[PDB]
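Blackboard transcription, Thursday session:
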Amino acid sequence: ANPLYQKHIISINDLSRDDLNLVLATAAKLKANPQPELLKHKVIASCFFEASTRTRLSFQTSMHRLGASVVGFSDSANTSLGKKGETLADTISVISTYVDAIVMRHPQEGAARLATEFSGNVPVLNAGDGSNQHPTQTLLDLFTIQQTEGRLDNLHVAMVGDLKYGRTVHSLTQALAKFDGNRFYFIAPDALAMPEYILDMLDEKGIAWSLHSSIEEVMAEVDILYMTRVQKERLDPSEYANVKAQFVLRASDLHNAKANMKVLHPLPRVDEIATDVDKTPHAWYFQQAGNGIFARQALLALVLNRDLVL
Amino acid sequence: ANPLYQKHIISINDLSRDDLNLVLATAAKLKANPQPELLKHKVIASCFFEASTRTRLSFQTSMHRLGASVVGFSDSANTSLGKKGETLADTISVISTYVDAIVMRHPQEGAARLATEFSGNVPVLNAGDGSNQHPTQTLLDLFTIQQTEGRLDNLHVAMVGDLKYGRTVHSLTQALAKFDGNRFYFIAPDALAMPEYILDMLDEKGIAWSLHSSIEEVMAEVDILYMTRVQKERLDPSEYANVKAQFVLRASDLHNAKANMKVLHPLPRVDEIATDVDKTPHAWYFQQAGNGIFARQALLALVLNRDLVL
Amino acid sequence: ANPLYQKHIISINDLSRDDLNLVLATAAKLKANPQPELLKHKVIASCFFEASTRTRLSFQTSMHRLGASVVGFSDSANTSLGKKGETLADTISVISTYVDAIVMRHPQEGAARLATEFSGNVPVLNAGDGSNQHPTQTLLDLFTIQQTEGRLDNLHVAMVGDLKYGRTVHSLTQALAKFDGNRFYFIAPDALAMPEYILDMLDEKGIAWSLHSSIEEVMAEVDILYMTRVQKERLDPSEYANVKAQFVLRASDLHNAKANMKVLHPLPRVDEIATDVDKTPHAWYFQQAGNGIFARQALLALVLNRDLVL
Amino acid sequence: ANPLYQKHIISINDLSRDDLNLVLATAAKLKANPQPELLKHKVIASCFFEASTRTRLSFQTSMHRLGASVVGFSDSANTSLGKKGETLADTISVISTYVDAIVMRHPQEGAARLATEFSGNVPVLNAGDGSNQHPTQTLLDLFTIQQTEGRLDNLHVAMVGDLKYGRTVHSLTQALAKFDGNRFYFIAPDALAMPEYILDMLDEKGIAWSLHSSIEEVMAEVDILYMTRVQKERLDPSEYANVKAQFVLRASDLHNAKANMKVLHPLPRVDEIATDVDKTPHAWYFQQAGNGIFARQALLALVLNRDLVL
Amino acid sequence: GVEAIKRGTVIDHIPAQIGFKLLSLFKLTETDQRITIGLNLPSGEMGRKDLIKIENTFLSEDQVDQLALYAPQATVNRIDNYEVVGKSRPSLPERIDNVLVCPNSNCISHAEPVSSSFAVRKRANDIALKCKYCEKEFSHNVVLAN
Amino acid sequence: GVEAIKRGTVIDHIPAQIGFKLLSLFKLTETDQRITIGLNLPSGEMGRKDLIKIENTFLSEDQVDQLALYAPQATVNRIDNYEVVGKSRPSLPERIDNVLVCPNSNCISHAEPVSSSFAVRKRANDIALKCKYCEKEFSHNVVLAN
Ligand SMILES: Nc1ncnc2c1ncn2[C@@H]1O[C@H](COP(=O)(O)OP(=O)(O)OP(=O)(O)O)[C@@H](O)[C@H]1O
Ligand SMILES: Nc1ncnc2c1ncn2[C@@H]1O[C@H](COP(=O)(O)OP(=O)(O)OP(=O)(O)O)[C@@H](O)[C@H]1O
Ligand SMILES: [Zn+2]
Ligand SMILES: [Zn+2]
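(Written on the board underneath:)
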């Protein structure tokens, strides 16, 4: 059997370096020689209790690219699920009697791990549960860094933006900390700094990280620039504005980065990466988006297929 | 390659007489000998930013009738798309990394032509963009007029209703003006008259049109009666009512029309065509609706399939 | 008893010339030597079943400036008991048992006239019943025209904008048409022109009027320029913007306007009058609004008081 | 004329020490021998464009306790004309034509200062303009601090909670910083600490302040404990709860507090003050709220009255 | 008077107050190159006029044509060795891009990342401009208020 | 840099690419008088400069001071009868009324008929600009960016 068979993907913290490597090596072969009737006759539930049309669309295209059928919903703007006091436990206990896999995004941290206790034997893939995990978005990031860098080790990674609350950047730091020689640079306003427990985990393993004030100080030695969105609601209208000059990326700024440098972003990108970075060969956030299809397919294939020989 | 291959259908104004004829001749063969695994393994996005369940249902049945998979959404009643300042440009730039074709309906005129600039090479089929185009509804109308009349030229076409604001009737006039010998009769209250630029285009090509006050004056020589909905919100509660006697079609009125005459309507038909016209053999609006399946399939097949030999 | 003592003020056409004058003469008295204790111990009810803050606040200030107490509401949504099955008839049958006069604004035409039949002897005044009447606005427009010009006779009044649907322009014409020698220039988009019947009445009385495509054509002949707000959504956005060099007043169009010419508007104004107009001494819309108090005080004082000694 | 006669009360920093005192001395007079007929015949407008029931009800009670009439509104939603294109400028240009003073609360900072330019001579008072000023709350906080302590000089005042965003803590500091000998202990979560500029001003005047991690460290030194509500959603739920043994007051923490120490809060309070605090004689938040009446009566009496004999 | 440079383009006879509008709309100032601008130069020849002289710079064909909507009579001059190597005048181009704004308020060109494109058609008395996107046709007068 | 006009202001050594901002911003272009503008000139040390000559117009003390944020070393020469009968430099003003936009998006100013106003304070090292309406202080760095 393959090691991720019938396993529930809930956290980056539960996946090992070897699993990261197997999911990323599968995606590679699936991107190259596609297997469009592999999950033929399988029905996957895509249950988005929290509405997230871009993740939804990715996951569902990935399911169709492999011949799986899809049923499911997107709520937040009320469907019916989670009313008349029906518990998430009973809801998953009923959906496991039809589907072969459950993909779910939910607004409370922990939901996906609770579904796990009631699904019995249908794997539960977590597409985002509150301020906590989102493994699928780290797997597509890692696959994009490996595609472009050639390596997941010995990298120089800058993480720019709201690192306090950026869920995406916290898992990529824990994921990348699983590999060797990585050096991090955190660039964030003081009210949005990389929380302590991340910083503690890094030190404890002997990983090197520095804090910088401007992206400009570090442009030359950076391999991966991961931008994240400054959530204006976390700051005052006046606080946001007067960051004295801001943390936006502009194509002028990159007139200095190494040839291999790639600007990543989980999206939406609103104000923070200006339009002129798009014409730059370093702009990679859209190509990052499309590799979500491959990381998503790798996962659905490995979890549902006992020995994949491709 | 076929001439409509990989081409984006945005406007009736960009399609030629020959293209109208090829899309209508394909639909004919697809209605007769159906090809249910032609778009096998293709995934089409049906992105309805403006909710329109009858067009949606048509387009999606058409996609399944050919073996395509469908992902997508209907918003207006909020999904999530087009918030946190995410632009339509970035949204289409991300959906082109998964789907093979984009079908979209949007509330602003011009949206479908903007999607065109960011989709790169995935064709964008416009299912309605503001008060401007809707090619797919003209193609099903034309296919219905040709099915029943045997011809797209030398016709006597009455256009009854709100012609000022009727988007449907403006494109059918531009589409039909591409063929010969057509004569038009416009029957509309004065506040809802056929706008000047249409009238100018007609004259400039030498096409004959008259204005009438009652449908009754013209019943005898009419081949196609295209009803459109009088939008009560465009008039006062008192203005609507006191049109002195109204512009409703009733089966008594047709006791006079030629054998071949067919009453068309884009629907909903609310008040304007009474129920007794349904039992009349001239009633064709539902059969018109079902030919949308064939015009829709023709199009998806020609745009996605390099040489169709059927 | 004064000629309007205990009368119902429902519609302008129901008041004679002599009534309009009585009102307008009182209103000038209450302005100069006010009696702020005149309705001491009366309780007027402010029932806005449609909500309007400026009219609500104007009438309630008037009630207060004569020492009266108000009970009342507003909604444009469910209120509670008023909505729970209740017919306006019953609502009125019940409040006329509590209060001394009823002022009421409602969404359906004829609301305040049906009220008149269920209020017993309690006078009801119309603050706007749907698209029919709004007699209180016209009384302050006439008080303002009379106070800037010296008379309501032999005036060249120009009415501009949405002449088809604005309540106000229709009532102002019927009221000035009760005085002599007036000349009216109507400047409207033809989608929104003056109704035939206003015009028909104006010819029965041999009253002079003309139609103009733009304000500049009459700028020099005019005494009162009554701007009305062109309401955007009644037109197509493209339609709305396309119109010439508009029908909006700017300060430079006032260069040729007479010294005594004043600009009036019912408010809200938005892009129909530009700010630089506010500076010129012809700008009179906010003073107009202010005469709202004095005009409505007259009407309240008169309906509720036997003989007014002022 | 009194020094504040016909002045606009917009911001605390705009009032001198001598102004704060004049206000605070009147307020103690109107408390002891009230004159409930002093604004007989004035009409004040209560315009809450943002709604706040306790502030609305406090100011309107004050208007009533001096024999004045109120006209006014509230919304936090569409009101009607106020929303239909209207600029606050025009709204004010029109109500200053009706009323004698304007009290107004609004969501955008600077709302009441722009009003000042369109109200003619009508004074406008700020009931809270966005995150900038709320001068009326600070006047009743100072009246309460003065009435419990005997002075506004040489006080050890501790400010607690959301020192970063609470309007009130920032104004209270600028106002007490106009008196002498005060000492300030600031006890905040560092995500929510005092802004640099409050502190910078405090050092320009050589004013003593210190930062503390928890109320127990200063419990014994304090005269006024100004609790502010830690607003939950500005923090992550996990973040919010994680903080130590909190910054919430319980009755047992008051064991070492001076006999004259009072606890103040602007209200609403929820889990920042526990019920057992309400019982102790240091609980003063509801009496504080009650001084709202007397403080606002002073301000109304003073702006609207030539010479106050009390 | 403003009058001599070695090489470049001298745009002459710009009808007063348009000379500023052309610098802004066509961004002629974003060059670190000798520009001499003369606003409200008298010249009895036309009453009052404006003149842009951009040095060692030559506008070409298309660039010359856009001016047509604004300064329709500008004599554009190629100065190439201290004197006039060739003149030109504005010809109406088939499409005007980037400079105009759509009147259609619901035209999507308004929120998005896209430069406007309008196609020019001299409709007998004036020129009509059809937007690329919303395809609404407008009187260029309507358009140039924007 | 150039020569004679009788009567008028000559603003010399405006940095470079600021000469257009000033024209744009303080609307010096809406006169009927000859204005000559010279862009990216030599004959002022720095080599490169912009210069503006407006005849029959003389700028007041405070108008001089509005230049200060943009061109602080601008010399504002006062010409009468072909000769420089006066020279001023821009000092820092207390209030830069009208030409800036408050970076705080919730300021009421944005939506309304009010001219902006900022109290200016501290010289050269950092200039703090405080909005009149929302009473928020900002570094001139942010205000003078959007
Ligand atoms: N060498 C040059 N450098 C800069 N500008 C020049 C040059 N030669 C001509 N001009 C400008 O061209 C305008 C006059 O050129 P030109 O002789 O082409 O005009 P014209 O309209 O053909 O007049 P005419 O018949 O009266 O001679 C002037 O504004 C002068 O400044
Ligand atoms: N009559 C004039 N017409 C137009 N511009 C003039 C006139 N006189 C002087 N200027 C412009 O004034 C600048 C030089 O004037 P001015 O003599 O005031 O300079 P300065 O700084 O006092 O120099 P210096 O000591 O070197 O003579 C030049 O840009 C010349 O551009
Ligand atoms: Zn457009
Ligand atoms: Zn501001």
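Lecturer's comment: Chain E touches chain B through 16 residues (CB under 8 Å).
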